[PDB]
């Protein structure tokens, strides 16, 4: 089974690109992220063609990008999504694992 990155991983598909820390997520399920398609785990990139390459930021499908990384309700946990539920009723820790800006995610 594949490997995980290093740390300092940029996403940045966005002018609002975000650094993503394997070793922070060891206590999540590779499979969570890197999710089955056609019954096998993918790990390609999220963005790539015919997966979550729609860059319109308002597109709800399963080709939003921004979508798969913020909404809640998803198949899959989201960035977001995951994080609101870390951070529970702690105001702080809302501010730093999902607030929109000065955020661990957006400075
Ligand atoms: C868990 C053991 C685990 C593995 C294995 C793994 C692998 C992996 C690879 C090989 C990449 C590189 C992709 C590339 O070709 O560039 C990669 C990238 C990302 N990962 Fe991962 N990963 C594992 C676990 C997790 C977990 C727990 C999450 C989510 C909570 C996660 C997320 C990501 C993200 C985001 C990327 C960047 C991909 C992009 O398109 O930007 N990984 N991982
Ligand atoms: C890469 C690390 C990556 C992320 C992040 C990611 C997330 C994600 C979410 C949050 C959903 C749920 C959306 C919803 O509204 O329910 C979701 C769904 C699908 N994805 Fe994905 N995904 C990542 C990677 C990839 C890759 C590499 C592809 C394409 C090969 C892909 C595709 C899809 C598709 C299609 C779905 C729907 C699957 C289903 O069972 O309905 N994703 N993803
Ligand atoms: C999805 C692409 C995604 C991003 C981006 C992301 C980022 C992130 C950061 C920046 C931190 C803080 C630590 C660091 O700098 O690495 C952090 C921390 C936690 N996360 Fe996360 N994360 C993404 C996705 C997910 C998913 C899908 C889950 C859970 C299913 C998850 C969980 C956590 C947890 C737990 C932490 C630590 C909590 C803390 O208080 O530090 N993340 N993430
Ligand atoms: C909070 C509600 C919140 C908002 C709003 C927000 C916005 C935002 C924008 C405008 C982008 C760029 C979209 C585009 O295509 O132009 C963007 C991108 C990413 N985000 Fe975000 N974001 C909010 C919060 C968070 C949090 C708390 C995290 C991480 C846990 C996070 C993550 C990401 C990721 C990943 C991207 C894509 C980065 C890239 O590929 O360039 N956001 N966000």
Redesign the pocket.
């Given at each position: 089974a594949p490997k995980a990155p290093a740390?300092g991983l940029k996403?940045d598909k966005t002018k609002q690109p975000?650094?993503?820390?394997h070793?922070?997520?060891k206590?999540?399920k590779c499979g969570?992220?890197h999710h089955p398609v056609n019954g096998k785990e993918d790990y390609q990139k999220?963005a790539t063609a015919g997966c979550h390459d729609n860059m319109d930021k308002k597109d709800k499908s399963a080709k939003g990008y921004y979508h798969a990384?913020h909404d809640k309700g998803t198949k899959?946990?989201?960035?977001?999504?995951?994080?609101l539920?870390?951070?529970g009723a702690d105001a702080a820790?809302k501010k730093?694992?999902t607030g929109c800006k000065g955020?661990?995610?957006h400075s």
């Open positions: 740390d996403m975000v650094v993503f820390n070793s922070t997520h206590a999540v969570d992220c999220c990384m899959f946990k989201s960035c977001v999504g995951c994080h539920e870390t951070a820790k730093e694992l955020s661990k995610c």
